[PDB]
Amino acid sequence: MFSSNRQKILERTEILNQEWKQRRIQPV
Amino acid sequence: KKCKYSFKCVNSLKEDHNQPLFGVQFNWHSKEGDPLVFATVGSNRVTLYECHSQGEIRLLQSYVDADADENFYTCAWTYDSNTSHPLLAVAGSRGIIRIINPITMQCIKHYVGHGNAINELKFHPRDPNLLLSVSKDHALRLWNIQTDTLVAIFGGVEGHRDEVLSADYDLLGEKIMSCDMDHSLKLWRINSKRMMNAIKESYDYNPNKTNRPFISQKIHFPDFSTRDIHRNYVDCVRWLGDLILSKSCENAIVCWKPGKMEDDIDKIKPSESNVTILGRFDYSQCDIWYMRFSMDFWQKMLALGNQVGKLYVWDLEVEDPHKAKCTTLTHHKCGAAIRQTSFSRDSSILIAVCDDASIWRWDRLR
Ligand SMILES: CS(=O)(=O)c1ccc(-c2cnc(NCc3ccco3)n3cnnc23)cc1
16 A cells, blocks of 8 residues: 555656746745 | 654744744745745734745745734645746635735735635645635635636535535645544545536636626535544644545544545545545644644655644654654744644755744754
8 A cells, every 4th residue: 555655646746846847936 | 664854943933923823834836946935824914934044034024914803824825827926825714815925915815705714725736726715614615816716615415514624635636635623524526527617617707708707616515525534623634645644632643545445546436435544643742623734745754743842753655654753853942832834845944833923943954
């Protein structure tokens, strides 16, 4: 359970991270 | 394995209003190279701070709501998808969502509709315009903040039957797990054809091109429900991949899943009667209502503050939760209840906020 759940986290957070990398949000 | 993560308290300050601080969030939308900024919420105040080198917590802006009786319980950051301008949503006791421009520190707009206080606000992980609010009115509401529309109300005969305390979208934003005062945890799939069409329709709505109001979806039935995990209120829920983390009064964050051990989360049917408890992240003296746990962006660290000023941290990469404990973060001057904690996006800083209006900065060692 742990290993396959960790891989799901890695893959899904990497998708979110790639989406964030393409962004240029104005600083506060 | 065991946890090796270490932190050092580099700074602390107390907000001049002297009221409890109920929420804190770093802005995870800031780009690499830009300063690390966090917001705190308490009383009728929203305060922005910048984390500088040498441990400095520099006050940036202070928002004071015109309503002196407002009590903010939560905040969530987002961005305007057309201008890349950062935005901050706040809500509390008045049951009004306020959208703040964090640069001018001015309220741009507000969303009325909940019949009671708002406990939690969460933005969709892929769509910055999709705001989820959870209320003491027994419902969850999904808003489109670009078109100022109410997309859906999650509630009714099989909805929560008591104050909704917390909710979380999963990593890809296909589903929501929510929890209430009546010990219930409910799943709401938002990747259904009905919900996907409601979101599309909310994007097309403009009150200048029709004299008809936008019709929100009324979701009366969840996609899974359980009252067989905790024996009391559940005030914090988060997804951990396909698994769930939730806490009650038991001095443990419970890791569990809908169905039996082998059941896939996306094969779970609304009539599923099984549940499986996998483990527990145990701690001490955190059995008062409204104490939230947090995770870093990569979901490698879990943190929770307790009612006597101790900050518990766990390594989520250690299989056995009983063995995942990091050295507890304590300070002799930190003795008030820690309501919420927030990690910076890069996990280099952990901020804690307290009932005595104090803010605690913990920097991670390498
Ligand atoms: C008497 S006191 O010590 O001043 C005091 C202490 C605590 C609270 C309080 C704090 N947080 C939330 N919600 C956010 C939340 C956290 C977890 C789930 O939902 N609340 C809703 N209703 N009360 C509150 C208010 C006053």
